[PDB]
Design a protein around this motif. Structure first.
Motif, PDB file in Angstrom:
ATOM      1  N   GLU A   6       0.824  -1.202   0.000  1.00 48.56           N
ATOM      2  CA  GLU A   6       0.000   0.000   0.000  1.00 48.56           C
ATOM      3  C   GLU A   6       0.866   1.263   0.000  1.00 48.56           C
ATOM      4  OE1 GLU A   6      -3.010   0.050  -0.574  1.00 48.56           O
ATOM      5  OE2 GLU A   6      -3.575  -2.022  -0.130  1.00 48.56           O
ATOM      6  N   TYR A  25     -10.076   2.655  -3.590  1.00 47.10           N
ATOM      7  CA  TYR A  25      -8.721   2.331  -3.202  1.00 47.10           C
ATOM      8  C   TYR A  25      -8.669   0.973  -2.498  1.00 47.10           C
ATOM      9  CZ  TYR A  25     -10.707   4.319   0.998  1.00 47.10           C
ATOM     10  OH  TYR A  25     -11.526   4.574   2.123  1.00 47.10           O
ATOM     11  N   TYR A  30      -5.368   6.146   0.118  1.00 45.05           N
ATOM     12  CA  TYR A  30      -4.371   6.390  -0.903  1.00 45.05           C
ATOM     13  C   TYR A  30      -3.593   7.608  -0.520  1.00 45.05           C
ATOM     14  CZ  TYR A  30      -8.010   9.674  -2.310  1.00 45.05           C
ATOM     15  OH  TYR A  30      -8.984  10.659  -2.333  1.00 45.05           O
ATOM     16  N   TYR A  60      -3.307   3.798  -9.485  1.00 51.38           N
ATOM     17  CA  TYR A  60      -3.367   5.250  -9.286  1.00 51.38           C
ATOM     18  C   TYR A  60      -4.572   5.838  -9.920  1.00 51.38           C
ATOM     19  CZ  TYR A  60      -2.005   6.191 -14.137  1.00 51.38           C
ATOM     20  OH  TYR A  60      -2.041   6.253 -15.522  1.00 51.38           O
ATOM     21  N   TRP A  93      -9.391   4.081 -11.114  1.00 48.07           N
ATOM     22  CA  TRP A  93      -8.054   3.574 -10.679  1.00 48.07           C
ATOM     23  C   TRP A  93      -7.459   2.791 -11.851  1.00 48.07           C
ATOM     24  CZ3 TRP A  93      -6.213   5.638  -6.362  1.00 48.07           C
ATOM     25  CH2 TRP A  93      -7.120   6.173  -5.468  1.00 48.07           C
ATOM     26  N   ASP A 122      -2.431   4.638  -5.007  1.00 45.59           N
ATOM     27  CA  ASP A 122      -3.108   3.658  -4.142  1.00 45.59           C
ATOM     28  C   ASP A 122      -2.144   2.622  -3.530  1.00 45.59           C
ATOM     29  OD1 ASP A 122      -5.054   2.256  -2.852  1.00 45.59           O
ATOM     30  OD2 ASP A 122      -5.781   1.237  -4.648  1.00 45.59           O
TER      31      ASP A 122
END
Ligand SMILES: O=C(O)[C@H]1O[C@@H](O)[C@H](O)[C@@H](O)[C@@H]1O
Ligand SMILES: O=C(O)[C@H]1O[C@H](O)[C@H](O)[C@@H](O)[C@@H]1O
Ligand SMILES: [Ca+2]
Ligand SMILES: [Ca+2]
Length: 129
Positions: A6, A25, A30, A60, A93, A122
């Motif tokens: 993470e 996320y 994130y 991301y 994402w 993320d």
């Protein structure tokens, strides 16, 4: 499958904060880069079985535009102004994969803004290439 690390936990943040505003996320949130330059996320414990070229897959979000990050491995810059292209929404994402050399055992990886700010980040997933 690799290991997912993470962005929000297990890292050192510079001019960047943990955020939960946009859904989707993994983990507890994130990271939001705050500064156009010199904002950073550093992973301190990327743990590999082997030395070689790795796939590092960033998950991301980026509403519009391209934002470029410097990428360091074990303290050495190894990608300059690497582009992260838009995902279209702060709750879209996407994935971007780079191929970088890392060692077996414990490594560090640092991503840094350079003038265009950063995507909301993320996690990363590291696999052997
Ligand atoms: O050696 C490797 O490259 C791989 O080692 C595995 O054990 C880790 O789970 C994976 O994240 C690494 O990419
Ligand atoms: O453009 C940006 O960098 C920022 O835009 C907004 O403020 C958004 O809420 C943030 O999550 C994002 O980091
Ligand atoms: Ca930001
Ligand atoms: Ca996360």
């Amino acid at each position: 499958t690799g290991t997912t690390y993470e962005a929000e936990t297990g890292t050192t943040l510079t001019d960047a904060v943990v955020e939960t505003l946009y859904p989707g996320y993994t983990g507890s949130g994130y990271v939001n880069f705050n500064a156009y330059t010199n904002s950073a996320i550093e992973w301190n414990a990327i743990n590999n079985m082997t030395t070689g070229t790795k796939n590092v897959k960033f998950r991301y979000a980026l509403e519009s535009g391209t934002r470029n990050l410097d990428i360091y491995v074990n303290g050495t810059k190894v990608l300059s102004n690497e582009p992260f292209t838009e995902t279209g929404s702060w709750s879209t994402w996407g994935e971007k994969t780079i191929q970088v050399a890392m060692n077996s055992g414990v490594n560090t990886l640092r991503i840094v803004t350079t003038g265009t700010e950063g995507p909301n980040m993320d996690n990363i997933t590291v696999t052997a290439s």
